[PDB]
Amino acid sequence: SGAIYVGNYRVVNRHLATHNDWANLVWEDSSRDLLVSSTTAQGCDTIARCDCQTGVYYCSSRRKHYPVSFSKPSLIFVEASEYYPARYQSHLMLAVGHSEPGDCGGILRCQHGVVGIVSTGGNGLVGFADVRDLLWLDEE
């Protein structure tokens, strides 16, 4: 579990979005595993605006943050998990690391701020849903 809190926006994994998220929907994309809802209180996070390929992510199934190198966002085949069938996922970054289903929502960060959230795992990789292209998160 986990979210990004930027301005008056909550960014969550689409598959973990709540009824209240859907009732306060700003934007969602199944292909990216992302949903954004509106919040009453302003949040503490800053979104990265960059093309970094090094950062640190939180792994809840290890209670640990890990430094990783990751691929630039692309359109990648993902094998079946407990929460999605085998399918193509867009705007996905991969690194070598540990990721189980419950790790979804952990933050990946670089020197510029939040890069994305854990969205995939298995076979010794961790996959992150990028948010750095979503410039509208910084305003309005």
Ligand X SMILES: CN(C)S(=O)(=O)c1cccnc1
Return binding residues.
50, 52, 110, 112
| β-strand pairing of 54-59 with 87-96 | unpaired
**8-state DSSP, 47:** B
Using CB under 6 A as the binding rule, whether residue 53 contacts ligand X is answered as no
Which partner from the list ligand X, Zn ion, none does 76 bind, CB cut-off 5 to 8 Å by kind?
none
Using CB under 6 A as the binding rule, whether residue 25 contacts ligand X is answered as no
Which partner from the list Zn ion, ligand X, none does 112 bind, CB cut-off 5 to 8 Å by kind?
Zn ion
Give the CA angle between residues 21, 25, 28 to the nearest 5°: 100
Torsion sign over Cα 4, 126, 108, 51: negative
Using CB under 5 A as the binding rule, whether residue 56 contacts Zn ion is answered as no
- Of the candidates 8, 90, 98, 101, which one interacts with ligand X according to CB under 6 A? 90
59, 91, 104, 130: which one is catalytic?
Answer: 104
State the chain's maximal CA–CA distance in angstroms: 40
Q: How many chain residues are in contact with ligand X, going by CB under 6 A?
A: 5
15, 29, 65, 98: which one is catalytic?
Answer: 15
| β-strand pairing of 64-69 with 9-13 | unpaired
- Of the candidates 10, 33, 73, 110, which one interacts with ligand X according to CB under 6 A? 73
Look up 133 and say whether it is catalytic. Answer: no
**8-state DSSP, 23:** H
Which partner from the list Zn ion, ligand X, none does 65 bind, CB cut-off 5 to 8 Å by kind?
none
Task: Report the binding-site residues for Zn(2+).
Answer: 50, 52, 110, 112
Q: With CA atoms as reference, report the closest residue to 60 among 105, 124, 125.
A: 105
